[model samples]
Target: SLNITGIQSDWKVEKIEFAKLTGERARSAGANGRIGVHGKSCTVDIARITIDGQTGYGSSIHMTPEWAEDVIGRRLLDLFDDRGRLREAYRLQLEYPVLDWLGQRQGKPVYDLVSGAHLETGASLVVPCYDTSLYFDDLHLADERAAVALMQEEAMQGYAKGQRHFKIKVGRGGRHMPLWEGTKRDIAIVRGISEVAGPAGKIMIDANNAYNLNLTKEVLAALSDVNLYWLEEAFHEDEALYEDLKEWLGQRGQNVLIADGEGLASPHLIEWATRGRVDVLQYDIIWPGFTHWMELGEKLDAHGLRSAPHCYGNAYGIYASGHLSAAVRNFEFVEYDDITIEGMDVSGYRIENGEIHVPATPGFGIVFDDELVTYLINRSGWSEGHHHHH
Candidate 1:
């Protein structure tokens, strides 16, 4: 028990502050959807909240001070429920902060609170993750063998970091190189990564919607013998195209799943998922907020569809997706990116044997650096005492 009823009337938010964190990725990463560059460094904002007689919390790096202030004077029970879910009266943006607070006060992991484990069965402490770092490192290499080796080596690097699944970026043919040469290179690199990641390693590929139905079929045919786990964004997510692709693969006996929905996707995709047009729903853990993710999780379970919410290229997605996998049934990989932030500590959680083991400590087990706290307080810091104006 988080003592919900006891704190319902009295507990209130003392302050709501906003702070910044930057995510850095190693190596020169290329564009995925739009114009991107060598360095994939992203600086985003997070809400640092505090209560009376308590310090501040560190998580939910996707909010503004305006969004933060929405819950400042609200009662805990009104903002959230006993199960640690945010109330309908509040915006879904508060899922990260509200749940973090409940998990901390209740001395339960945030995932456990959502999993209904304390009320019933227990959720798994370890959530499986996949390495999504295989990028266009091979664009510089004119030699096909060198290109293949580079992608293979990077996949191995993620493998060394305890990833048994690897997603190699496909479709260099469209922008980076010649169609004839790039298609051949794509197949070679896929084969090369498959060899290095080993027979047991799961291999998924993302085209960022570069290939049409014919190109998709062609590419898959080229890699007919290669053991692929899934194909992502194969053209702009058409229900008919996916249905045809499914039958095409069904005839050939290739068990590759069709995954989409990270970028500009259709509302129809979710409906298509139930009909078997799409095997996996990848609606990005970053967008429309995590609250929808909770609702979608149950909807997906009802239909028996697997989810692997695209957690690409961001620190928030990396941690948040783990909580998603822990709470939802039929959940797939946490799309892992190599990221580090200056203000937070993930020492409590560790990657071992391809799974991120959630700690027993409350509220994400994320500890803020004292120096960053001092820095945040110096800027954009707000509380009852310094509430700007009466």
Candidate 2:
């Protein structure tokens, strides 16, 4: 795959370091059915790599000093092929910094490097984004009408921020409250939200695997007037159940996308999706990283299985997932978390009328405030776990 020229394939890693960075949510988010609360912030590690005078940083779950020690001085081409897919797929976390370094050095966007569409005519480069911020924020309110209206206002907030598509967390019956009562309340909220979103809106619901087949059916029947974009994690992926669910949907006039595989997804989920039982493959974006997705884009393109990797709480993933729009043929929507990380400049990317126009700036187009990054590292425990191993 190292078929491209002028990328300086001889470059080698000079150092590896990691630091802890926390990103704040748009507002203090609320709980889903099974979870207690989302809270105000989410913490993740940032793995920064120094290679041939360039410093590339990317988000990570964790990477210890030992991991850093193990990677220094490796040839760039040994880890990443020229086409941007990793040579060894399991070496996932390194792809972020590696891809970033490659793009920054080449003076092109990361999407341009991966897609090889440099100045290629016919690329729109704008990934359609959705507002994934609606949670159970209204549950604290007392009355049904109050809760439902509060939910509608949240959608309108996202709308004001230029989001026409939304993902609503449902399944109040799963753990938050009593069975039929919670189900009824959830249905009411859904209906109200649909009304406020207007005719051009796309409403997506995620039950977090709370509802079974019959319960899903009952809920869908109640919202017969509304058109839903997709139902995510409706239940654990089951071949027979999904096949039957698709058959049932076709039998009816409803056209809803059956999306699954975020957390604790069935290992055979992709096989089922390939078998035509599932409509979208939503494996989490950052855990597997970009190189895996680059390779996966080819496989998914072959099978015609659409992808929209789960990136809800992870802030970097929201941007990383959209870059797939450039390469992955069947990419449908980006799960925009609608959060902000201070000092991370995303000015090049603009959200207008629900689409994210990605800039052609070098790397991710996200310019980090180096001073702020140093200050964050200087005060933190994982600060400058910088090891030069050459």
Candidate 3:
């Protein structure tokens, strides 16, 4: 646990397929180094840190897994084996995280782990949880079936309690709902889920940069009948597009909030937060180190904005995100992906009445099932594209 250097891990890419918008495939560039599914490989690396022999870890994903490793190496070098001439590198590697977290906290960020710092000193980070149980389809893609199965089996369990807020993925890729699935299918899905949800449930859709101005207007028109909690990533990342979408939704008297930031890297956090680009800064702790992510959340808080860390992977991430969520008051809610829970078999934390009750434990506060690790390792497609029948 203490002085741990780094750990390397990988999950293979199962399968990749593309849908043609017309005669030619409308290929979207992959987020990080690897080309998502078709690139045929997915991997992640993390640095293992041991303080007084206690294990501490960090990682990066959703961007480029390689970025995590590089940042870890750079942090190690800056913290230890740094040359006097490498002042800027050290500053960029270290001070950036400090400044980012400081901006997040909306106060003076700490550069080092000195005594009496609120974060290292005594303050703990907090993240919000929106117990998602449904994935609304805007355009049907191959991944939807798998994602749907995962939700039907495991996701619904969380909703059995009071986890009413649902984060559904939409877009042009595998996650997109059928924009043309007929008014009936769309209406049926919404009405059915709402009936199941009763009066208290809220539905939120994530477009993942799939819709354009015209498409967004149409989707909003259809969604107006249903009470939407938020419309996330409905349009592209362009600020103008988002602003226009916001105005359009506002004109309809929709209470839907615009939640984003899952795709933003560390450097972009401040820009997004400072400019008020989103209502909620959705963060992924594993994508950024927990420490740095907490910093980002604090920045949003400073600007009177809120953040909700995106959760994927297994229960380890759940625990890590939960701790992170607990640290910030400005946190809106954390995203609960059912695939992660079933895939990881995370033990130690319990979800009751839709609330994630973090156990009082050291480190991540959860014990990972080694069997699941083996299962995940054997299943190269654990997260990429392979479908798990269970």
Candidate 4:
């Protein structure tokens, strides 16, 4: 057993601060009746901390503020050393700033540091993006025609901005209608979006685990003509379902890939890869930390699969994903939100002709706008010296 005195804790979390960004640009993706439209949006909590003379930040727009506060004042060295072995959720709260501080100390971008240590694949500065604006709803789009029009408009807007790929929600569920009606609506949206996307643009569907095997099969058959790029999370990660779908697609001679794994880690990712379950693997660097993320990336590559980091939340999260895109060879595209956050600093980054350029500055290449930071800090009312449970 290790002695108590043998463990060293040199760094302390000096200050903990929080900020929230809302409005049209910083809205939720409407995944659980949580819709953000017409300037109505959800809050994205931004956590800033100072540790041993280094300043770092993380954001949790997808989670609640109370959840982020539960893991504020832990020692950075201890958290970094934990490496997802235990208390993974708490560790994730510190991942953003920890990696930022590490990269800053090394005088490099986080991806470069990761790539130098682990990746043999060459990095790309520019990453292709897919638009994720079209959401499923009965309120905003009451009927098939309204849904079609909305999807077409969103697709056109993405095309105008140089995006060649788009992701839309499917599986309307029983809340909207019966399974038959929902399936019809799902097929209609696919057909309509395919028409607008043309032959050049690609369409990807995220069902959010809204379909069972029977419904998925029926929907796939109906959508045969739409030529989907991939169908994502149609069901839970069941090996039998995935195998059946892969076999079913083979019989039909369709090349549509299955994509998932945003909520998986080492063991689960390895299981999926070893079983040849998914064609595309989506993981996020924010949750897994940089070092472990690269480890997972290498594992996927070894199994002949690609990594596409899920991009959500503020510019900080996007930049984090962008760095991974820049450093990895297997990345097909990084996700891009159609709307911009209200006050986030997105300087030195541009999306043109369907690709975004990663920041050239060291350490994730982001500097939050000072005024915006101050406004959020003051608005959240979290004092500088208040320490919470480690």
The Cα RMSD of model 4 versus the native structure comes to 5.5
Of candidate 4, the 10-residue stretch with the lowest lDDT total is: 31-40
lDDT (Cα, tens digit) per residue for candidate 4, span 182-289: 778878877888898777777888886778878888888888887588888887778878888888889999888888877643356457657777888876656654
* Candidate 3 residue lDDT tens string, 92-148: 223222222222222222212211123353443333366543444222334434434
In order, the Cα lDDT scores of the candidates are: 0.73, 0.78, 0.45, 0.65
Expressed as tens digits, the lDDT of each residue in 128-172 for candidate 1 is 887887777777789999888878788877777788888888877
Give me the displacement of residue 269 in model 2, in angstroms.
Answer: 1.0
lDDT of 3: 0.45
Q: Going through the candidates in order, what is the number of backbone clashes in each?
A: 0, 0, 40, 0
Give the Å shift of residue 214 in candidate 1: 0.9
Ranking by lDDT: 2, 1, 4, 3
lDDT of model 1, residue 348: 83
Local error of candidate 1 at residue 16 (angstroms): 0.5
Which pairs clash inside model 4? none
Better of 1 and 2 by TM-score: 2
Give candidate 2 misplaced runs (Cα > 4 Å). Answer: 1-4, 81-84, 116-124, 381-390
Worst 10 residues of 3 by lDDT: 17-26
lDDT score of residue 218 within candidate 1: 90
Sort the candidates on TM-score, descending order: 2, 1, 4, 3
